[PDB]
């Protein structure tokens, strides 16, 4: 049997006009085979107000094996990595279906930002941050959907701590990545920050 | 009280429920028409996924609104 | 993984079956093809379900066992 | 940043990474410093085989952190 | 499952298959896909030249393995 890739995603995308602004795909180029996906940050998320970027690539034997799928937008999630946007979601490894679509993939990421299972993490240092200090951990992910994803806003206290740091002469994603990572305490981010 | 769920062969199917009905109840009668069992069902409307005890009154679902279908998932 | 499993050619006249649409390829049950039934009563063009079969053990759409 | 790289032999490897860096990339440092083809190192590290499309901040391995390499058939 | 199979040229190729495929499958598979004659193809995994009479499974060649061609 024909790899019905192109096609089936042809027809995910003839099947898509017929609906009612959460999610969406686009064509990166004449290239069926690489894709570009957005998701609105879930509300009542840390998230919400945020529009996150996909990077959605489609193996040859799609819909037979799932979708390569990671967040070009940066986002701090225990399942999702700081640093590449790799996801790990099962539905994206040992429990894709066929059956599934782009569609309910992007949804199940929706819902995957709701719902963090930081005990099997990609990211440690967010789980970390996400189990012992969960005040601390939505602040940073707000953080994070503002400055990264268009959210509204971000908590002034940590971005006074940035602008702090940043006029030291690091380079602000430098900063945030510090920051985050050691629990928003100056003292251990700017060793981090200086060290070589 | 007629709703719509997209479900998991791309279509949608109605509903007749009440905003009294339970998540539980709307899951069950998705199995009804479907064949996926509640354990593999999971209702997302606009980004929120619903849980079972509440209802479409607490997560206010009227008219004629439309729940999306997902097998359940799990961050790893 | 070689399954007896239920098989039949799509009679658009004879539908005694619930669906009308194979998910995999996400096209219609056509007349004269062949579809098969899997133990949790889903349906699809046995060329397509066949090869996911191969490499899972488990239904497309529902994720029951195909094999018990 | 430094890290350590042991094997079952004792040999310690120190490499120069960023958090940043994936597994894989660390795996091609190893190569580079070792000649062992990517596709024959195992790293292990605090009860984890690690992936190569994880970083070494995927896994908080910050500096001076020691790696456990383990070979795989090379005969086959 | 899926594995890869380097070129002489340098392209690296995949290819779903299923282990029972025996090694004369894959020479022939592989020339539908790119290829020239499998009877000029050499395909080497884990040092061991690969005899066409075998197949997949008695070299274990798992999920996401490489395979590289030479010529003879
Ligand atoms: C989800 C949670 C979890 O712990 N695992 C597997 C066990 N495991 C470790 O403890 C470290 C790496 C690893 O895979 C899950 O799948
Ligand atoms: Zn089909
Ligand atoms: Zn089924």
Same mark, same amino acid.
């Given at each position: ?6 096609? $089936?995603? &042809? $027809? ?11 999610? &969406? ?7 069926? !085979?690489?894709? $570009? ?10 998230? #919400? ?16 094996? *799932? ?6 937008? &940066?986002?701090?999630? *225990?399942?999702?990595?700081?640093? !590449? ?17 782009? $569609? ?12 963090? #299972?930081?005990?099997? *993490? ?11 200090? *969960?005040?601390?951990?939505?602040? !940073? ?15 002034? #206290? ?23 990572? &050691?629990?928003?305490?100056? #003292? ?9 | 009280?007629?709703?719509? @769920? ?10 007749? @429920? ?7 109840? @709307? ?22 996924? =619903? ?18 279908? @997902?097998?359940? =998932?799990?961050?790893? | 993984?070689? %399954? ?25 049950? %056509? ?11 889903? %349906? ?23 094999? %018990?």
């Amino acid at each position: 049997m024909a790899n019905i890739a192109v096609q $089936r995603i &042809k $027809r995910e995308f003839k099947e898509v006009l017929k609906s009612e602004n959460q999610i &969406k795909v686009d064509l990166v180029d004449e290239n069926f !085979t690489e894709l $570009r996906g957005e998701i609105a940050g879930p509300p009542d998320t840390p998230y #919400e107000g945020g529009r996150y970027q996909l990077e959605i690539k489609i193996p040859e034997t799609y819909p037979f094996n *799932p979708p390569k799928v990671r967040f070009i937008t &940066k986002i701090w999630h *225990p399942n999702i990595s700081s640093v !590449t946007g790799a996801i790990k979601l099962d539905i994206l490894r040992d429990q894709w279906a066929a059956a599934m679509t782009l $569609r309910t993939v992007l949804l199940s990421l929706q819902a995957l930002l709701a719902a963090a #299972e930081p005990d099997c *993490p990609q990211d440690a240092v967010v789980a970390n941050q996400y189990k012992q200090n *969960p005040e601390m951990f939505k602040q !940073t992910a707000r953080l994070w959907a503002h400055v990264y994803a268009g959210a509204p806003v971000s908590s002034p #206290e940590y971005t006074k701590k940035i602008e702090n740091l940043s006029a030291m002469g690091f380079d602000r994603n430098a900063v945030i990545v510090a920051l985050s990572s &050691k629990s928003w305490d100056v #003292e251990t981010a700017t060793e981090l920050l200086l060290s070589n | 009280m007629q709703i719509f @769920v997209k479900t998991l062969t791309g279509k949608t199917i109605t509903l007749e @429920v009440e905003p009294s009905d339970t998540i539980e109840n @709307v899951k069950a009668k998705i199995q009804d028409k479907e064949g996926i069992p509640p354990d593999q069902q999971r209702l997302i409307f606009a980004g929120k996924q =619903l849980e079972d005890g509440r209802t479409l009154s607490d997560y206010n679902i009227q008219k004629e609104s439309t729940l999306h279908l @997902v097998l359940r =998932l799990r961050g790893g | 993984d070689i %399954e007896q499993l239920p098989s039949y050619r799509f009679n658009p006249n004879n539908h005694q079956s619930e669906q009308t649409l194979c998910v995999v390829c996400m096209c219609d049950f %056509e007349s004269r093809q062949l579809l098969r039934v899997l133990p949790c009563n889903h %349906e699809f063009h046995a060329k397509c379900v066949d090869k996911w079969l191969k490499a899972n053990r488990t239904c497309p759409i529902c994720r029951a066992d195909a094999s %018990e």
